[PDB]
Swiss-Prot record:
Lineage: Bacteria, Pseudomonadati, Pseudomonadota, Gammaproteobacteria, Pseudomonadales
InterPro entries assigned to the protein according to its UniProt record, in alphabetical order: PrnB, Trp/Indoleamine_2_3_dOase-like
Pfam name, any one: PrnB
Pathway where this protein functions: Antibiotic biosynthesis
Consequences of knocking out this gene: Cells lacking this gene lose the ability to produce pyrrolnitrin.
Similarity section: Belongs to the PrnB family.
Protein known as: Monodechloroaminopyrrolnitrin synthase PrnB
Assembly description: Monomer.
Outcome (variant: residue 309 to A): Loss of synthase activity
Protein purpose: Involved in the biosynthesis of the antifungal antibiotic pyrrolnitrin. Catalyzes the ring rearrangement and decarboxylation to convert 7-chloro-L-tryptophan (7-CLT) to monodechloroaminopyrrolnitrin (MDA). It can also use 7-chloro-D-tryptophan, but 7-chloro-L-tryptophan is the preferred natural enantiomer.
Binding-site residues for heme, renumbered to this chain: 309
Protein EC: 1.14.19.-
Record GO biological process: antibiotic biosynthetic process; L-tryptophan catabolic process to kynurenine
Length: 343
């Protein structure tokens, strides 16, 4: 999976940045959360919160790293029943400035807490310090860079003719990158206690209010998989619930993925174009048969992520949102279209 390298290196740039010199301070947050010490949590944040304004030399990297370190306090304060912007003076203007500097929402996202978060024991930021949280973060680190590579490959595949042997080849490569999502779920199912997730981790992921609206807490739901699938199969879907789902999470993904999304909203999806071409040319063409077959395997790997993921989520929530089952159904229907072309 040679394409992963560059994405992982960009993540590592943010992970290596500590512009507020906050590492040793943020590591004390788990203890304070365990003690439910709200004044203490506010006090610890005020030790490094740049209430006077952001240093002028900062770029995206520093601002994202700053949002990461302040971010864990945001989830923590809400977990104890407090709007962070209401209990921390001068916090809201800092959060809005960091949002400006990153073109991201004014709170921590999945990216901040996982790939932009250093991995070492003496550096990794966490809400709880629990081994289950460490496993949860690792599960996302397994597949994020591969997913970003997969988005790039999907956009490239879009302009590849089914009549070309490249279609089958690019589809096979895409499947290999998407396999990492399956590995993530396997890991999460093996290593994360459902009870510890539901009782101890879940409380830290509530929404907070900043700038007169609500921003969702970090979650793997924020992974730009929905952008990949928008391009792949979903862009022209008439399912209103599905459209609402994608529009909900769009703000939380990187600006480049929001632009990819907008680019393809007014186009037929890859699947639609590929099926139209297969039907136009005939299935007697060997490159058409091979292209569709390889494309079917892309849907197979998506289902091998999505179906086990539903079980993972239902197991935790038995200690799950209907959105999950509905999306699974949509994905089966998409694969069925491909199977029907080959039949
Ligand atoms: C114990 C671990 C996990 C639990 C309890 C869980 C729970 C959920 C829930 C309840 C949803 C529905 C949206 C929401 O209400 O937040 C969701 C969506 C989603 N989750 Fe997870 N999740 C877990 C692990 C993971 C992992 C490890 C990944 C991938 C690395 C992942 C990827 C996704 C994605 C991409 C969605 C959007 C819906 C979809 O594509 O099917 N989740 N998750
Ligand atoms: N809300 C679920 C579970 C979740 C909450 N927070 C999470 C992190 Cl920080 C990483 C993975 C999963 C995760 C999801 O969105 O997948």
């Amino acid at each position: 999976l040679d394409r992963v390298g560059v994405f992982a290196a960009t993540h590592a740039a943010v992970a290596a940045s500590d512009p507020l010199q906050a590492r040793a301070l943020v590591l004390q947050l788990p203890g304070l959360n365990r003690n439910k010490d709200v004044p203490g949590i506010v006090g610890l944040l005020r030790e490094f919160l740049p209430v006077r304004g952001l240093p002028s030399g900062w770029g995206f990297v520093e601002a994202a790293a700053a949002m990461r370190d302040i971010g864990f306090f945001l989830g923590s304060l809400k977990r104890h029943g407090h709007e962070p912007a209401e209990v921390v003076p001068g916090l809201e203007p800092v959060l809005l400035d960091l949002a400006r500097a990153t073109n991201l929402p004014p709170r921590e996202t999945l990216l901040h807490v996982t790939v932009w978060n250093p991995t070492a024991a003496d550096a990794q930021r966490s809400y709880t310090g629990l081994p289950d949280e460490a496993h949860l973060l690792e599960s996302v680190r397994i597949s994020m860079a591969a997913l970003e590579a997969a988005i790039a490959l999907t956009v490239e595949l879009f302009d590849v003719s089914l009549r070309s042997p490249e279609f089958a080849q690019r589809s096979d490569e895409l499947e290999a990158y998407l396999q990492k999502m399956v590995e993530s779920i396997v890991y999460a199912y093996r290593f994360i206690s459902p009870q510890v997730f539901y009782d101890e981790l879940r409380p830290f992921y509530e929404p907070i209010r900043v700038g007169g609206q609500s921003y969702l807490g970090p979650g793997a739901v924020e992974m730009p998989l929905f952008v990949l699938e928008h391009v792949l199969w979903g862009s022209q879907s008439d399912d209103q619930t599905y459209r609402e789902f994608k529009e909900t999470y769009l703000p939380y993904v990187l600006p480049a993925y929001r632009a990819v999304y907008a680019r393809f909203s007014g186009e037929p999806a890859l699947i639609d174009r590929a099926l139209d071409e297969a039907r136009a040319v005939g299935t007697r063409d060997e490159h058409v048969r091979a292209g569709l077959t390889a494309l079917e395997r892309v849907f197979k790997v998506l289902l091998r992520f999505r179906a086990p993921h539903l079980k993972l989520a239902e197991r935790a929530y038995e200690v799950a949102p209907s959105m999950l089952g509905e999306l699974l159904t949509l994905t089966y229907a998409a694969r069925s279209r491909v199977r029907a072309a080959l039949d």
